[PDB]
């Protein structure tokens, strides 16, 4: 059941082939190839949005503009 | 001078032609037309960015970079 904690999976996909920052976080050894420079990270973290951030979003939303993508569907 | 206050002019462009919520904030003279349903607001605001936003941009950047 949905447990009301506001926790959700948090994914980071690191395709860091060729990256000069050495990997140090894996725990299962080496593939002997480019998988050794890539990683999927999964955490379970609480999702939170501050009231101040929500105020910034409202000031954007209230004008009924849009991004490049999508049809314009507003009537206002 | 750049005064180090982190303030900037926040502009809100309210073109609310046809909107059922009545104008009230602007109390100057009326145009007698669609300009009475539209407004430019400006305000000096301290610009703030949260920890959460910063963490989100960090995660985006890590996921989009390669080398």
């Amino acid at each position: 059941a949905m447990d009301k904690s506001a926790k959700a999976p948090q994914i980071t996909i690191f395709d860091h082939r060729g990256c000069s920052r050495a990997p140090k976080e894996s725990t299962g050894g080496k593939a002997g190839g480019q998988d050794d420079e890539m990683m999927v990270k999964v955490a379970s973290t609480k999702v939170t949005v501050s009231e101040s951030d929500a105020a910034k979003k409202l000031q954007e939303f209230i004008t009924f503009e849009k991004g490049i993508d999508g049809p314009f569907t507003s009537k206002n | 001078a750049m005064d180090k206050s982190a303030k900037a002019p926040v502009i809100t462009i309210f073109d609310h032609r046809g909107c059922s919520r009545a104008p009230k904030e602007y109390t100057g003279a009326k145009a007698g037309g669609k300009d009475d349903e539209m407004m430019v607001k400006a305000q000096s605001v301290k610009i703030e960015v949260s920890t959460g936003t910063a963490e989100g941009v960090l995660a985006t950047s890590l996921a989009k970079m390669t080398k």
Binding site: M2, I13, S26, G29, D35, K41 | -
Partner: protein, 174 residues
Amino acid sequence: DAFSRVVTADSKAAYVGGADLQALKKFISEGNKRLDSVNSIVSNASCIVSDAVSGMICENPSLISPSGNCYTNRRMAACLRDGEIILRYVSYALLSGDASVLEDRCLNGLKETYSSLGVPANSNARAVSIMKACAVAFVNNTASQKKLSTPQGDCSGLASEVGGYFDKVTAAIS
């Protein structure tokens, strides 16, 4: 196993790289394409959620009127948060190739909670449907912001799969 522990038991993050990542890609279909598909959504999540909530509101501005469910910073924050939660569970369903966690941890009981709170189902359905459209375009790399160097090929199967996860959300809350 490592992701299951995290998303349900083990508090610390799972770091799957190297040989563990090689193994992961043998247990999910189309592993390399699937990780590209997940990244195309997760790395663009901020714009997806913002565009979906903005579009829900621009189609129904009463949501931010004094009687609307997004009125006040507190409520707008909770709505933005919920869009991100939903998108996160859909993205994890695509990563894992399965809906089980999405169903158990995000959807089961959700409609009952929204009914009690008065969170409007038609509006919520629209936020979800805008997020769906965003995700399909990102998987197929046809959004306005494109990933430059993905190897070309057809990801329409993965795009159908993610669409089905969104449809589970819609069915559960509408």
